[PDB]
Design a protein around this nucleic acid. Structure first.
Ligand SMILES: [Ca+2]
Ligand SMILES: [Zn+2]
Lengths: 343, 80, 80, 320
DNA sequence: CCTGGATCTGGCCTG
């Protein structure tokens, strides 16, 4: 639980809330900059490098056949395994939502060079609506893979939306979607165990089971302490989706997931209420068919974190998260960033 | 009022126990005090001290908001 | 002669209706533009050979087309 | 005014000025949200409420702790309501204009208005003390004027009303005031997209308005001429001010404009920038980044305001 | 013994 302050060079004005870190082969990469991508880096993805508590954001070019994607501001990330990376949904800089799936993978690597490849996957069937704040995961059942997508937040539909309430958002429908990446097919599944919308939840994947927990429901304005488990088996016919409500859940929203050990996850960050901050850390020790969410010791927070109202971060991948604080009135550099080790 | 402002900024850093400090530690003490004064006393921060800032600063509510950021309590009763 | 060319060219993009305020300066804007261009290229070779500011390009290149299209430019300005 | 009225009524005995509650009650006749009006067809994503005045320009942007921190204050008029108010106070001018052109007064022909739009941010507007968000010390105003009104009589087109002093401060009618930064793109798009949605809806319909005992019919043409070069490059999606592509109206580059300097033609548009940004993000030809930018001519972002190809003259004077 | 790129770096364009 070592907590260190991290300085950063001349691109601190590029990190916004809602960024995303992809960990390719122990190397961290930044995505989701602020504003449309400048001529200093036309792709938008960067080389997230820290040593000696100093950070530098070098550019990272794409392949020839890749597609130049907009900087999504609240997407759903996923770690496939020919190792690749799945992003879907989120806000563009012009505040509309995107319904695409982009797949990120390394085209070539040279002596400290990287060139990604980004292709766009087309979804047919029950196409989910463009949204943000949701979550996607992949499961491995009977030697096959399937992308499970739970709902998030979006605008009003295109007939009920008026310009006097144009940016008003509403929680999505609580369906569950099964996305087949190698064919571009999506089938919705309505489940009676899931009644409310949910957004900014954390989701832990396994062989065939996903454990969604936390998450703020907009329509009734609560952060309910629930814990669902979705069991997906893949027979020859339709895949059978089964949600069972479990007890023992916690009540957060937009907390940060990290994987320290195998079958071991830490929950850090997020909010308990509006005026309240989740200042404790939840140790989630998995099993083959069990979830044991327990409280660990808390990391000694400094006084500029204990009195902020906002913070945000993501998972660097190697058991270390990277969170940022709003500095103060912009007037200097507007953000203080930290790092946090987890064993 | 500016002299008391410097006292407040020097008490949240415990300079009576850290008699040496860098530039950046003092800058961070100033930024922390600015954020907490805006959060508590609804005061935007300024570089040139005014008179209305001076009347709104020399209250007991501001020393409660500042005493929220001192670790000790002898410094609390001294500032009080 | 540079300033004479520029003052022959200014009341076309400044007039609120240049076809009914200065048609004589409007009807030969192309000749004054080319004369201004060759005097930038020849007598001022040390500054505008390989680079030119944007508003010089907008002023010399486009504005007969814009004044044919809309009718005025100073009416559609932004001083209001 | 209260001091002046109070001491004039105290000296003369008479009541020369009206007390300011009467001013307030006579003020609401001209503020937005007073008159009846009917769109034909109805406007998409626009309610038909006819009493909407000063509304929060956030338009219900979610201010919770879980998502993107917004820190701007905005107030605005609904666009069609403001166009109705600005058409209704200059009723007498339209009537006198058609009178002086040997037209009737009972005529209800389809008027073609032309409305000149302009937006520019400001600096050093000081933030106040007190409760509220962490507002930046910059303001952005969106405003419009009404340049010409042309009615069709017979076969040809006659004009009725003309703004006689078009760059006045008496005719730049305000529409939206936000405390944002025009450098920032997220909050700018978030505040400004309702007005663009209303304008895009209003571009393809008709307004029916009762003007002096007679219902008459209007339709609009919006021209966004009043933006400086920085805002046009930042909004229409082109590269910034120091690129190698210079002109926001054509595809020329800086060196080849230093060589030719006279012989060009206006080429850029809004729909062309839409097709170009789709070309940039779709990448249909698998080209590398440099030849992609050379194919797409510097378009590398999604435009979100249709701005006409024209030139601001004030900053042209200052630049020369 | 370069040398071919990484990387600054100061000038220029608009506010
Ligand atoms: Ca300005
Ligand atoms: Zn040009």
């Amino acid at each position: 639980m070592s907590l260190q302050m991290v300085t950063v060079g001349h691109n601190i004005a590029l990190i916004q809330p809602g960024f995303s870190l992809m960990n390719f082969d122990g190397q961290v990469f930044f995505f989701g900059q602020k504003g449309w991508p400048k001529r200093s880096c036309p792709t938008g993805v960067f080389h997230f490098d820290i040593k000696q508590n100093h950070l530098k954001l070098k550019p990272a070019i794409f392949s020839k056949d890749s597609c130049y994607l907009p900087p999504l501001r609240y997407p759903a990330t996923c770690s496939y395994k020919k190792h690749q990376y799945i992003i879907h949904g989120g806000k563009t800089p012009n505040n509309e939502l995107s319904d695409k799936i982009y797949i990120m993978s390394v085209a070539c690597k040279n002596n400290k060079k990287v060139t990604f490849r980004c292709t766009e996957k087309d979804l047919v069937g029950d196409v989910p609506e463009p949204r943000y704040g949701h979550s996607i995961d992949v499961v491995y059942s009977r030697g096959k893979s399937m992308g499970v997508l739970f709902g998030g937040r979006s605008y009003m539909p295109s007939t009920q939306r008026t310009t006097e309430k144009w940016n008003s958002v509403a929680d999505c429908l609580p369906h569950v979607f099964l996305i087949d990446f190698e064919f571009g097919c999506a089938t919705s599944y309505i489940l009676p165990e899931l009644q409310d919308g949910l957004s900014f939840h954390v989701s832990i994947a396994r062989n065939d089971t996903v454990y969604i927990l936390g998450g703020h429901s907009l329509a009734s304005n609560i952060r309910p302490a629930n814990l669902y488990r979705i069991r997906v088996d893949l027979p020859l016919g339709t895949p059978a989706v089964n949600c069972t409500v479990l007890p023992g859940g916690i009540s957060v929203s937009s907390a940060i997931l990290t994987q320290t050990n195998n079958d071991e996850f830490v929950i850090v960050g997020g909010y308990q209420l509006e005026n309240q901050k989740r200042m404790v850390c939840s140790l989630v020790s998995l099993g083959d068919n069990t979830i044991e969410i327990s409280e660990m010791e808390t990391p000694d927070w400094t006084s500029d974190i204990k009195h902020s109202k906002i913070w945000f971060g993501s998972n660097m991948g190697n058991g270390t998260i990277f969170l940022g604080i709003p500095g103060d009135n912009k007037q200097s550099e507007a953000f203080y960033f930290y790092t946090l080790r987890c064993s | 009022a500016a002299e008391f402002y410097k006292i407040f900024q020097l008490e949240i850093g415990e300079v009576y126990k850290h008699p040496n400090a860098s530039k950046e530690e003092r800058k961070r003490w100033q930024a922390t005090l600015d954020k907490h004064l805006r959060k508590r006393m609804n005061l935007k921060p300024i570089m040139r001290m005014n008179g209305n800032f001076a009347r709104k600063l020399m209250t007991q509510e501001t020393v409660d908001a500042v005493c929220e950021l001192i670790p000790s309590e002898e410094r609390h009763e001294a500032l009080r | 002669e540079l300033m004479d060319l520029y003052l022959k060219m200014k009341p076309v993009w400044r007039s609120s209706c240049p076809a009914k305020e200065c048609p004589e300066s409007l009807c030969q804007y192309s000749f004054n533009s080319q004369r201004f261009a060759e005097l930038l290229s020849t007598k001022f070779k040390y500054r505008y050979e390989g680079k030119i500011t944007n508003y010089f390009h907008k002023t010399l290149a486009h504005v007969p087309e814009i004044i044919e299209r809309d009718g005025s430019i100073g009416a559609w300005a932004s001083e209001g | 005014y209260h001091k002046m009225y109070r001491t004039v009524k105290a000296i003369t005995g008479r009541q020369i000025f009206q007390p300011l509650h009467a001013l307030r009650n006579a003020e609401k006749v001209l503020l937005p949200g007073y008159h009846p009006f009917e769109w034909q067809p109805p406007l998409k994503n626009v309610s038909s409420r006819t009493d909407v005045g000063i509304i929060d320009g956030l338009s219900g942007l979610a201010s919770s702790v879980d998502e993107y921190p917004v820190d701007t204050i905005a107030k605005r008029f609904r666009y069609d309501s403001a166009l109705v108010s600005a058409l209704m106070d200059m009723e007498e001018d339209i009537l006198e204009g058609m009178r002086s052109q040997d037209l009737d007064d009972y005529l209800n022909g389809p008027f073609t208005v032309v409305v000149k739009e302009s937006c520019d941010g400001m600096g050093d507007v000081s933030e106040k003390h007190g409760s509220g968000p962490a507002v930046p010390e910059k303001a952005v105003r969106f405003s419009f004027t009404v340049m010409r009104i042309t009615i069709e009589h017979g076969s040809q087109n006659v004009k009725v009303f003309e703004e006689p002093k078009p760059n006045s401060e008496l005719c730049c009618k305000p529409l939206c005031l936000m405390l944002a930064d025009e450098s920032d793109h997220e909050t700018l798009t978030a505040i400004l997209s309702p007005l663009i949605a209303e304008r895009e809806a209003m571009k393809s319909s008709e307004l029916t308005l009762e003007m002096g005992g007679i219902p008459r019919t209007f339709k609009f043409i919006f021209r966004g001429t009043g933006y400086d070069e920085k805002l046009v490059r930042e909004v229409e999606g082109l590269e910034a001010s120091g690129s190698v592509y210079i002109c926001t109206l054509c595809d020329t580059t800086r060196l080849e404009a230093s060589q030719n300097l006279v012989f060009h033609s206006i080429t850029r548009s809004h729909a062309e920038n839409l097709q170009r940004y789709e070309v940039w993000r779709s990448n249909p030809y698998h080209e590398s980044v440099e030849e992609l930018r050379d194919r797409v001519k510097g378009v590398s972002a999604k435009p979100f305001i249709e701005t006409v190809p024209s030139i601001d003259a004030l900053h042209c004077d200052i630049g020369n």
